[PDB]
């Protein structure tokens, strides 16, 4: 219950950490490709800044995660072999970012399952 309330305060910390991400959340590939142009390429990496909050959730929960994650902010290191944010870097970089998207998605689902495993 203690660490839960601390995770609530950290939740408020994420709410106060919410600037670039407000209306949207973590739950999309075609959406990324479509919104890539309309986001000016700012809100793209700024949308990839969620890896910082994810890593924050990680270190707080101290629970092992399916995908290796390191949050560099704008361009974040996933497994060290893949970029978290392509930001329209290249054509092959879109494929690397695709595999990285599948990765982060899998880690998101697994983490969501870990959160669904919560009990008293």
């Amino acid at each position: 219950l203690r660490f839960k309330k601390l995770y609530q305060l950290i939740g408020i910390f994420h709410s106060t950490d919410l600037f670039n991400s407000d209306r949207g959340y973590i739950y999309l590939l075609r959406q990324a490709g479509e919104s890539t142009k309309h986001r000016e390429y700012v809100n793209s990496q700024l949308g990839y800044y969620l890896l910082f909050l994810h890593l924050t959730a990680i270190q707080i929960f101290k629970a092992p995660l399916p995908y290796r994650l390191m949050y560099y902010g704008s361009t974040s290191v996933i497994d060290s072999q893949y970029p978290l944010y392509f930001t329209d870097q290249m054509i092959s970089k879109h494929q690397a970012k695709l595999i990285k998207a599948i990765h982060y998605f899998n880690a998101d689902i697994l983490q969501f399952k870990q959160i669904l495993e919560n009990y008293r």
Partner: protein, 383 residues
């Protein structure tokens, strides 16, 4: 051989937090079917490939036993999954699945046959269960609550014969079947080893050794053949004692210690009798789990709380899958006796998990990997 791989854990999933799984088994094939029971009497089934790619983490299939389950095993060369429950409920569920959109999915789980173990009349709960199917004929064998060996014919769902271990041996410390399956290999809570011939319906031999403590597990190794058996138990320091049945000696004994054991103490105990008073160990390093296949023998070490792997090809190259953060252990064997060899292990933290009550080795048809279920009701996979 899967022992050479790094074996990093790519998944952590727990469906039921509340209780540990009493049994864990996997249905082999192109697309492995994961299965684990529950102490609350629940049957859970997960999809290998689905957990590998999409990483979806939930029960793909759920069956309600309504009563606590004892153990489970997958019928050889079959899609049927056999299970026994401490309510005295023995049943086998047939698998139903389909293939569409270049993938596979599961349909429904239904029990093919239902046989009450409560029909014995003494109301005994099934302890351990091992089933087998020979091209000749198919059958199953189980241990009663009083640790009595009972072999029921899988065909007629009836009892073929009933074997009973001597009360001087205490209870049954393990369950194993011979290569010809005409003989049963069972350990003793008294810290004895007993192999019996079902052919003539008698007890072939009774063996003992080491500190004469309880035997953790007993099984027939592959590379060691039917002429040699692997038994975890006996002497404290010794992790696993492998002894050749006919030879009457222990060929290879894997022990955790900084020194070589005593030759007179490691010698086979025969002349000893039932008068021995049982002496066990309450230490946390006692209870563990082990699974051995394809020349590789995997053993979960509760001592340092780490997964260890001993390759039968080379105990030298043998090492631990998952270990602590600071350093790992260096292991190497030697031989004092011409007929006996001994392996030594010399010792030199983000992951958090309880003791492992169950473990299973598997292949993804792409790359090999291992699955494990702990006492906290959590499951994980390492590739």
């Amino acid at each position: 051989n899967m022992g050479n791989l790094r074996g990093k854990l790519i998944a952590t999933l727990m469906e039921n937090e509340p209780n540990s799984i009493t049994s864990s088994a996997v249905s082999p094939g192109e697309t492995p079917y994961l299965i684990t029971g529950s102490d609350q009497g629940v049957i859970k089934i997960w999809n290998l490939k689905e957990i590998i790619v999409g990483e979806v983490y939930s029960s793909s299939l759920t069956y309600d036993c309504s009563s606590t389950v004892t153990q489970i095993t997958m019928i050889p060369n079959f899609d049927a999954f056999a299970v026994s429950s401490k309510d005295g409920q023995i049943i086998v569920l047939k698998v139903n699945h389909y293939q569409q959109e270049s993938e596979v999915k599961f349909l429904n789980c239904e029990c093919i046959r239902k046989i009450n173990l409560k029909n014995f009349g003494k109301n005994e709960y099934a302890v351990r269960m091992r089933a087998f199917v020979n091209e000749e004929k198919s059958l199953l064998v189980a241990l009663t609550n009083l640790s009595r060996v009972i072999i029921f014919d899988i065909r007629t769902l009836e009892r073929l014969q009933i074997i009973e271990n001597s009360p001087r041996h205490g209870a049954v410390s393990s369950i194993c079947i011979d290569e010809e399956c005409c003989v049963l290999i069972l350990g003793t809570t008294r810290g004895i080893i007993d192999i019996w011939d079902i052919r003539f319906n008698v007890l072939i031999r009774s063996w003992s050794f080491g500190d004469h403590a309880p035997i953790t597990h007993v099984e027939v190794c592959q590379f060691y053949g039917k002429n040699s058996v692997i038994v975890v138990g006996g002497s404290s320091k010794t992790f696993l004692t492998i002894w050749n049945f006919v030879k009457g000696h222990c060929q290879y004994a894997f022990i955790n210690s900084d020194e070589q054991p005593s030759m007179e103490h490691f010698l086979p105990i025969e002349k000893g009798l039932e008068e021995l008073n049982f002496c066990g160990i309450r230490s946390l390093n006692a209870l563990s789990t082990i699974s051995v296949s394809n020349d590789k023998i995997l053993l979960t070490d509760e001592a340092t709380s780490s997964i260890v792997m001993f390759s039968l090809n080379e105990l030298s190259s043998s090492k631990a899958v998952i270990s602590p953060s600071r350093f790992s252990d260096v292991f190497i064997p030697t031989q004092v006796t011409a007929n006996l060899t001994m392996l030594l292990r010399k010792m030199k933290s983000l992951y958090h998990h309880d003791i492992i009550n169950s473990i299973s080795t598997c292949e993804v048809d792409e790359t090999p990997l291992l699955v494990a279920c702990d006492n906290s009701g959590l499951i994980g996979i390492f590739q």
